[PDB]
Amino acid sequence: DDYSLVHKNILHSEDLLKYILETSAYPREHEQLKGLREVTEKHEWSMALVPADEGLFLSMLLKLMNAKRTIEIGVYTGYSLLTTALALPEDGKITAIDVNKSYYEIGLPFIQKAGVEHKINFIESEALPVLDQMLEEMKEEDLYDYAFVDADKSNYANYHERLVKLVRIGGAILYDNTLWFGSVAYPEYPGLHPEEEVARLSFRNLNTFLAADPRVEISQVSIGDGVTICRRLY
Amino acid sequence: DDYSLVHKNILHSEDLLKYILETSAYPREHEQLKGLREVTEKHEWSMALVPADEGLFLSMLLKLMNAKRTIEIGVYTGYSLLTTALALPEDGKITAIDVNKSYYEIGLPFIQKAGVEHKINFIESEALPVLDQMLEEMKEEDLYDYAFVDADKSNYANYHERLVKLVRIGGAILYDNTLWFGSVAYPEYPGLHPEEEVARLSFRNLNTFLAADPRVEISQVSIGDGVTICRRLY
Ligand SMILES: Nc1ncnc2c1ncn2[C@@H]1O[C@H](CSCC[C@H](N)C(=O)O)[C@@H](O)[C@H]1O
Ligand SMILES: Nc1ncnc2c1ncn2[C@@H]1O[C@H](CSCC[C@H](N)C(=O)O)[C@@H](O)[C@H]1O
Ligand SMILES: [Mg+2]
Ligand SMILES: [Mg+2]
Numbered sequence: 001d002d003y004s005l006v007h008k009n010i011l012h013s014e015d016l017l018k019y020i021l022e023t024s025a026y027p028r029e030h031e032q033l034k035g036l037r038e039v040t041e042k043h044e045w046s047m048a049l050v051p052a053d054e055g056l057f058l059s060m061l062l063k064l065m066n067a068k069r070t071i072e073i074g075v076y077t078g079y080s081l082l083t084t085a086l087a088l089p090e091d092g093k094i095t096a097i098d099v100n101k102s103y104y105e106i107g108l109p110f111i112q113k114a115g116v117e118h119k120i121n122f123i124e125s126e127a128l129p130v131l132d133q134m135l136e137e138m139k140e141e142d143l144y145d146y147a148f149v150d151a152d153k154s155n156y157a158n159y160h161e162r163l164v165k166l167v168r169i170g171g172a173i174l175y176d177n178t179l180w181f182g183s184v185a186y187p188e189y190p191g192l193h194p195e196e197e198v199a200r201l202s203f204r205n206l207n208t209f210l211a212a213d214p215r216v217e218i219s220q221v222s223i224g225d226g227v228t229i230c231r232r233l234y
Numbered sequence: 235d236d237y238s239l240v241h242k243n244i245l246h247s248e249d250l251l252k253y254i255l256e257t258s259a260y261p262r263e264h265e266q267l268k269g270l271r272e273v274t275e276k277h278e279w280s281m282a283l284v285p286a287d288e289g290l291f292l293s294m295l296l297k298l299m300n301a302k303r304t305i306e307i308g309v310y311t312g313y314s315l316l317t318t319a320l321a322l323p324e325d326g327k328i329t330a331i332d333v334n335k336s337y338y339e340i341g342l343p344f345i346q347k348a349g350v351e352h353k354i355n356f357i358e359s360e361a362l363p364v365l366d367q368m369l370e371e372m373k374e375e376d377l378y379d380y381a382f383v384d385a386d387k388s389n390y391a392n393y394h395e396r397l398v399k400l401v402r403i404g405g406a407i408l409y410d411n412t413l414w415f416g417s418v419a420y421p422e423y424p425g426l427h428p429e430e431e432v433a434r435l436s437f438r439n440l441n442t443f444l445a446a447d448p449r450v451e452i453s454q455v456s457i458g459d460g461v462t463i464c465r466r467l468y
Binding site: 009012017025028066179182 | 243249250252258259262290291295297406413420441444446451452454455456457462465
C-alpha cells in the first residue's frame with residue numbers, strides 16, 4: 001500500500017477507542033449515519049472518514065452554540081455533513097463544498113432518507129474559488145455560525161484567511177486532522193508518502209500560526225485525529 | 235497517593251501530549267492560570283489537576299454557548315474554576331462547591347489577581363446537601379447554563395440526578411475523568427488501589443447509564459482523562 005499513517009491512532013490503544021465508540025457513540029448515532037458509515041468503510045478512501053465519536057462532538061457543539069447557517073468544506077461521503085444537517089433546526093442551511101461529487105452521491109440516499117436534504121446546498125468545486133466568491137457577495141447579515149474544514153490538507157492556512165471573514169464574530173471554525181496521526185509531534189518524521197509529509201508540515205505550521213493568531217481564540221482537542229476549534233474575536 | 239494509574243496517559247505518547255500543551259495550550263494560558271498550575275503541580279494531589287489543554291476546551295465551550303451562570307463541583311486549587319471565571323462576562327456568576335477550602339486558598343491569590351473573584355461564591359461543604367438545598371429553592375428563571383462535575387467519583391450518578399433538574403433545558407453538564415486513565419476500557423483491570431477500582435467501576439456504570447438516558451444527549455471526548463458533555467433535553 002501507498003499511505004503510511006492509515007493504521008495509526010492518537011489514542012494509546014485500539015481497545016480504548018472501541019470502548020468509546022461502542023459505549024457512547026454508536027448507541028447515539030442516527031440510523032442513517034450508521035448506514036452511511038458502514039458503506040463508507042468499504043470504500044477505498046475509508047481512511048478519511050470522520051469517526052462516530054468525533055461526529056457526536058460536532059453535533060453537540062452545533063446544538064450548544066445554537067448554530068443555524070454553516071459551511072462544510074470537504075464532504076467525501078457526507079458523514080460530517082449528515083451529522084450537521086441532523087443537528088441543525090429544521091430551517092438550518094448548509095453550504096457544502098467538495099471537488100468530487102461522486103463521493104457525495106454515495107451518501108446522498110442516507111441524507112435523503114433522513115429527510116434533511118432540503119438544508120443542503122452542494123457545490124462541486126475547489127473550495128478556494130467558492131470562498132473568494134462568497135467574500136464578494138457576503139452581507140454582514142448573512143455570516144456563517146460554523147465552519148468545518150476537512151478538504152485539502154495543504155490548503156488549510158489559505159482557507160483560514162477567508163473563513164475569519166466569512167464566519168460571524170463569536171462563530172466557530174473547526175480544523176480537522178490537526179494532529180495528523182500524531183506525526184506533527186516531531187520536526188522530522190520518517191518514511192511518509194510525499195502527500196502525507198506535505199500535510200504534516202502544513203499542520204505543524206498551521207498549529208503554530210493558529211496559536212499566535214489574535215483574530216481567534218483556540219482549543220486543540222485530541223478527538224479523532226485532532227480537531228482545532230477557533231472562535232472569532234473581531 | 236499510593237494510586238497506581240497516576241502517570242498513565244490515554245494518548246499514544248508523552249511526546250504527543252507535550253506537543254499539544256507546548257504548541258496549543260501554554261501559549262494561550264492566562265498568566266494567573268500558569269501560576270496556579272505551577273503551584274498545584276507541586277502539591278501532593280497534583281494527579282487530580284485539570285490539564286491545560288482540557289481547560290482551554292472548557293473555556294471554548296462556555297464562550298460558544300454564551301454561558302452566564304454556572305456551577306462548579308470539585309474545585310481543588312481552582313484551575314477549572316479560574317478557567318470558568320475568565321470565560322464568563324463581567325457579570326457572570328459561579329457557585330463553587332468543595333469539601334476542602336484549604337485547597338481553594340492555594341489558588342485564590344491567582345483568582346484575585348485575575349480580577350474575577352467577584353464572580354465566585356465559594357461554598358465549603360459536601361456537594362449533595364448543597365445541590366438538594368438548591369433544588370428546594372430553585373426558580374426556573376435561575377437555572378444554570380453550565381455544570382462541571384469533578385468531585386467524588388463514586389457520587390457522579392447521584393450528582394447527575396440533581397443536576398438534570400438544576401441546569402436549564404439546553405444547558406450543559408460535563409463529567410470529568412470519564413475514561414479513568416483508560417482503565418474503563420476493560421471489564422477487569424489488575425493492580426489498582428481499592429478506591430481506584432471503585433471509581434473505575436463507577437465510571438463504567440455511569441458511561442453506560444448516560445448513553446441510555448433519554449433526558450440528555452451526550453458526547454464523550456478523549457481529552458485529558460475523558461470528558462462527557464451532556465445537554466439537557468427536557
Ligand atoms: N481543493 C479542494 N476543494 C474542495 N474539496 C476538496 C479539495 N481537495 C480535496 N477535497 C475533498 O475533501 C475531502 C476530504 S475527506 C472529508 C471527510 C468528511 N468531512 C467526512 O465527514 O468524512 C475529499 O472528499 C476530497 O474530495
Ligand atoms: N463529597 C464531596 N463534595 C464536594 N467536593 C468533594 C467531595 N469529595 C471530594 N471533593 C473534592 O473534589 C475535588 C476533586 S479534584 C478537582 C479538580 C479541579 N476541578 C481542577 O480544576 O483541577 C477535591 O478538591 C475534593 O476536595
Ligand atoms: Mg478529516
Ligand atoms: Mg477531574
